[PDB]
Amino acid sequence: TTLKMAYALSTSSHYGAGAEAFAKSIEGASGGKYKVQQFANSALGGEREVIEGLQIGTIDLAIVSTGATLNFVPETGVFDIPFLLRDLPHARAVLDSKIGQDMLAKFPDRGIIALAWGEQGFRHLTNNVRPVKTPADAKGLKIRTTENPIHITAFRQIGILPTPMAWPEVATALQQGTIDGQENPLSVITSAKLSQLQKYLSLTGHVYGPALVLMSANVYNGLSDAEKASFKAAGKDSAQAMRAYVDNIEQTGVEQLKKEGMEVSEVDRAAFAAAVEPAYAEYYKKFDKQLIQSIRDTKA
Ligand SMILES: CC(C)(CO)[C@@H](O)C(=O)[O-]
Ligand SMILES: [Cl-]
């Protein structure tokens, strides 16, 4: 059985590393009973369509951001609150804990199996208009966001004009100048060639970007208990490969982007965190305050 695995970016990206690790894991475990064929570079559409495909069973596997997943499992949105997950060790500890694992168990009610929390890293603001050194500098910029309402609410707080847009639209819109910028981690800014589309980078690190390794219920439900365990294991191997890719690009990424001609600014992240904090008025209408505190207090 050849399973079809979709993702948005190149085979040399963190998604590619994750998909390759998944493929090797399941092919080895299954003695070749299951093989993975990769559909990179958004060939099967935007992430929303990919998730819809898993629900119907036309796509078997995927690695996606949390850009479009709140339309399916809104409860996970808590992880998308700017500055809540503080750094890579904290984010990983939270997602690997019962807090994160309990969230994965919410997907099957929607016809989706969530095998593991993978990773993109911390998202940064890019644009074509001017350097952004302070939150004031960002006001008035037309910045593309994902479809994620938690992100959109945050950016409104510093006067950004957000335009939610699926990923396949972004390069064209940047070139056309209908949006001034976007935000994504070093892993994406490098692998998606955004230095060719964006003059300025500010290292806001405003939110951790998780990823999800997903599988169709169609396929998963058909498996034995041993086979289900092997897909969960491959999910974990995929997540580890993504985290290792991120650990590496976090060391080299800014240097790479400067070489490619980007003007990179460090910022005072505490100023940005303070500027977006009033959005908690909205977040507390969606998420339990005690869950948010438990995330804060998760160690490591
Ligand atoms: C680039 C991306 C599709 C990766 O999942 C996502 O981070 C997004 O939509 O910005
Ligand atoms: Cl897991």
Side-chain angles (χ1 to χ4, degrees), residues 5 7 10-30 34 36-38 61-63 115-116 118-119 213 229-245:
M5 185 160 205
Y7 55 92
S10 74
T11 61
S12 59
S13 68
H14 51 300
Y15 286 2
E20 185 68 16
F22 196 102
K24 281 196 199 137
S25 178
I26 195 65
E27 288 161 21
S30 74
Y34 289 104
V36 172
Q37 178 188 9
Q38 295 172 50
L61 295 163
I63 303 169
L115 297 170
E119 179 172 280
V213 180
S230 76
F231 281 81
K232 288 186 282 162
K236 176 172 186 179
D237 289 334
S238 186
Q240 289 170 342
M242 296 185 239
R243 294 169 170 182
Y245 185 107

Side-chain angles (χ1 to χ4, degrees), residues 4-6 44 49-51 53-55 57-62 216:
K4 304 174 177 183
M5 185 160 205
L44 305 187
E49 287 73 36
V50 165
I51 299 166
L54 293 168
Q55 293 186 306
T58 55
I59 297 169
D60 306 295
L61 295 163
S216 75

Side-chain angles (χ1 to χ4, degrees), residues 201-284:
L201 167 65
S202 290
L203 297 166
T204 49
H206 47 268
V207 74
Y208 183 72
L212 281 156
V213 180
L214 303 179
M215 179 172 186
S216 75
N218 164 55
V219 178
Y220 185 87
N221 293 339
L223 301 179
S224 68
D225 300 335
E227 288 171 329
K228 287 178 179 172
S230 76
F231 281 81
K232 288 186 282 162
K236 176 172 186 179
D237 289 334
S238 186
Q240 289 170 342
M242 296 185 239
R243 294 169 170 182
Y245 185 107
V246 168
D247 286 335
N248 176 84
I249 197 53
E250 289 294 333
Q251 298 175 57
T252 68
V254 170
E255 171 177 41
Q256 182 186 333
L257 293 173
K258 295 179 169 177
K259 189 193 164 167
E260 291 172 7
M262 286 198 95
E263 296 192 25
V264 181
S265 296
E266 296 281 4
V267 299
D268 181 344
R269 296 177 64 252
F272 278 82
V276 305
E277 198 180 65
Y280 267 95
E282 280 67 51
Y283 302 149
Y284 284 143

Side-chain angles (χ1 to χ4, degrees), residues 39-246:
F39 295 81
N41 299 297
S42 301
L44 305 187
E47 294 187 326
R48 175 183 190 98
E49 287 73 36
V50 165
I51 299 166
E52 289 166 343
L54 293 168
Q55 293 186 306
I56 295 165
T58 55
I59 297 169
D60 306 295
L61 295 163
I63 303 169
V64 293
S65 75
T66 57
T69 50
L70 302 194
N71 304 110
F72 302 89
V73 179
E75 292 91 336
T76 62
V78 67
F79 301 139
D80 301 309
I81 295 175
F83 299 101
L84 178 57
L85 300 177
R86 292 186 299 274
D87 60 14
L88 294 174
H90 178 227
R92 290 164 183 180
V94 172
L95 295 178
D96 292 354
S97 76
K98 185 176 177 181
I99 295 175
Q101 304 306 108
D102 280 357
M103 294 289 179
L104 299 175
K106 288 180 185 301
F107 283 80
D109 284 346
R110 299 300 179 273
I112 301 163
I113 311 290
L115 297 170
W117 289 108
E119 179 172 280
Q120 301 208 92
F122 282 76
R123 304 178 75 97
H124 300 295
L125 180 64
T126 64
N127 83 109
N128 270 326
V129 178
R130 62 180 168 265
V132 169
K133 308 282 214 307
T134 66
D137 292 335
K139 181 181 184 194
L141 299 173
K142 292 177 186 160
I143 303 295
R144 177 265 177 179
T145 65
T146 67
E147 297 159 274
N148 185 306
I150 300 311
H151 289 176
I152 295 166
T153 297
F155 295 138
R156 292 192 286 95
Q157 307 304 127
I158 53 177
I160 285 170
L161 305 183
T163 293
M165 304 183 11
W167 182 245
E169 295 172 45
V170 176
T172 292
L174 290 171
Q175 295 288 45
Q176 287 178 357
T178 57
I179 47 170
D180 302 329
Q182 63 87 60
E183 44 83 53
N184 254 299
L186 292 177
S187 59
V188 172
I189 297 168
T190 57
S191 70
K193 319 293 168 139
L194 301 186
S195 66
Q196 306 304 318
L197 307 175
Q198 294 286 260
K199 290 191 175 50
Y200 300 107
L201 167 65
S202 290
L203 297 166
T204 49
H206 47 268
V207 74
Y208 183 72
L212 281 156
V213 180
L214 303 179
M215 179 172 186
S216 75
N218 164 55
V219 178
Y220 185 87
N221 293 339
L223 301 179
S224 68
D225 300 335
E227 288 171 329
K228 287 178 179 172
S230 76
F231 281 81
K232 288 186 282 162
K236 176 172 186 179
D237 289 334
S238 186
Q240 289 170 342
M242 296 185 239
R243 294 169 170 182
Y245 185 107
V246 168

